[PDB]
């Protein structure tokens, strides 16, 4: 506060970080090894470094802000970080639609996702009412299973149910008949036999 009064600004930032004041000053303007790397790079780098160093509120905030201001490696990293932070504290669907508009990466992310994930998916489907769809179907195919599959596909449902069937019987036949409303006749005959 004293001895500082561009260079003095950055000094004030890094000093006040070692958090609100720091971030504010830094943004307004424009461990040692990391700092050197950041200087060499010269916003994204700075936020990434801060997030890494506090890895917390400050970190997460800075990271999110930078990611927002920016929007293969960098993109993927940022996305993963944001998703993790949000699941720790919507985000899923956003990131997904974003990247869709690195497939195996997404497969792993959804792997981590798999109850909250299911709820988010349900929400997305409700909102709606290619690659993404296929990936989802594959992950689901990897009671609970049949239900999730059905919900997502909303033929796939029917196929899965039939395969599982090949109280439970009655429920399945019933669900199939309602969804369809040849197949019905067959189901009825089977239930009667």
């Amino acid at each position: 506060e004293n001895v500082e009064c561009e260079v003095q600004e950055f000094m004030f930032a890094m000093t006040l970080f070692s958090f609100d004041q720091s971030y504010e000053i830094f943004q307004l303007h424009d461990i040692w090894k990391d700092l050197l790397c950041t200087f060499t790079v010269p916003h994204s780098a700075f936020y990434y470094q801060l997030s890494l160093l506090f890895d917390q509120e400050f970190a997460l905030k800075c990271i999110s802000k930078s990611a927002e201001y920016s929007l293969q490696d960098f993109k993927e990293k940022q996305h993963i970080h944001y998703l993790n932070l949000l699941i720790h504290f919507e985000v899923l669907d956003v990131l997904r639609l974003g990247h869709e508009c690195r497939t195996n990466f997404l497969q792993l992310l959804l792997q981590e996702d798999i109850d909250f994930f299911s709820t988010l998916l349900r929400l997305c489907n409700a909102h709606s009412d290619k690659i993404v769809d296929s990936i989802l179907s594959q992950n689901l195919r990897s009671c609970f299973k049949k239900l999730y599959c059905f919900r997502m596909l909303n033929a796939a449902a029917e196929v899965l149910y039939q395969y599982i069937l090949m109280i439970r019987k009655r429920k399945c036949y019933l669900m199939v008949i309602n969804v369809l409303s040849v197949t019905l006749t067959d189901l009825r005959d089977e239930l009667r036999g």
């Binding site: 990391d34 801060l50 990293k77 699941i87 720790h88 992310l109 798999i114 019987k169 019933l174 669900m175």
Partner: protein, 96 residues
């Protein structure tokens, strides 16, 4: 390392779902909303861990796709649990 805790929760809930589905077929021949909320928080923890992993000093974390996979599994389980909670559990002894 709460990544690993989330993986344990995913595995436990998965077995629980399979058990409920098995017990439903059994009787043809408890789970509350708190389990669904728990999987939502679990997804938030994973979004938080991945973000922190992307900004670590020295370089991004190597577990990016490993966490993306866990997210998918958790969403799939929240879907199944949400269907059971939403009525599919009272209709387990019925023909589909």
């Amino acid at each position: 390392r709460r990544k690993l805790v989330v993986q344990w929760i995913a595995m436990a809930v998965d077995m629980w779902v399979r058990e409920v589905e098995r017990r439903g077929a059994m009787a043809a021949a408890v789970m509350g909303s708190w389990v669904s909320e728990l999987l939502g928080r679990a997804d938030q923890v994973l979004t938080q861990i991945a973000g922190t992993g992307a900004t670590l000093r020295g370089g991004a974390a190597s577990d990016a796709e490993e966490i993306a996979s866990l997210r998918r599994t958790v969403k799939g389980l929240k879907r199944s649990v949400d269907m059971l909670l939403g009525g599919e559990m009272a209709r387990m002894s019925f023909f589909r």
